[PDB]
């Protein structure tokens, strides 16, 4: 079980956040109804590597139980206009043996915090 995409590395002090309507990775095999979920910070650590933020679709992942909006540390919430607030059970999570991660891509003009870069 893993994110369908690659992480956004936080190179900065600022944590990941997106304006409403922004921050959902592009997946052409997903629909407008699906375009909603959360990013989970995972920090590696002897030194502390930069934090990595992984996107999971709503209703999937380590915080599958959280409803959209719930407050938990290291959980931030994103959605695209048109998404529906239903669990995305059909998309699910990625099994690394059978499938490999999708390079996270954000639409042109997406607003990112300082220290975040999208190829």
């Amino acid at each position, epitope marked *: 079980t893993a994110s369908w995409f690659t992480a956004l590395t936080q190179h900065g002090k600022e944590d990941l956040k997106f304006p*409403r*309507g922004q921050g959902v990775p592009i997946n052409t095999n997903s629909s407008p*109804d699906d*375009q*909603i979920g959360y990013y989970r910070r995972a920090t590696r650590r002897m030194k502390d590597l930069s934090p990595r933020w992984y996107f999971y679709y709503l209703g999937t992942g380590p915080e599958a139980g*959280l*409803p*959209y*909006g*719930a407050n938990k540390d290291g959980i931030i919430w994103v*959605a*695209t*206009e*048109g*998404a*529906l*607030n*239903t*669990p995305k059970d059909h998309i699910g999570t990625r099994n690394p043996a059978n499938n490999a991660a999708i390079v996270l891509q954000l639409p042109q003009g997406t607003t990112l915090p300082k220290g975040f870069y999208a190829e």
Partner: nanobody
Amino acid sequence: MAEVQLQASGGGLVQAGDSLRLSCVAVSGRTISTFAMGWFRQAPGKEREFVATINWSGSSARYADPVEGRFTISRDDAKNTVYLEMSSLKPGDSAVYYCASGRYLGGITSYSQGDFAPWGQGTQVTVSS
């Protein structure tokens, strides 16, 4: 399927011309904020009918033709509740009323049934002549 996450209330038996006020409450962690919302109704022996949709901000609302001018849709995101204020009620407005969660940051143009999900448990409204 899933547990109910939207619950309508305030239905009753009323007489023609009376007004009623319905509420639909998100529960179990569900939020309605920054989502459009809808009210639908099922008359006895009849298909689901679009009644009203209010957009994500509350600026804008659309009503069905029969309900036009008599119903008013409203939202209070802080309490997670949507409301349908019904006036000069008619026997034909007799039905089961339920709300549904609409699309993220949507409104108005999206009034189809596929534009909403999940769907709420309803409350029965009966109007006598």
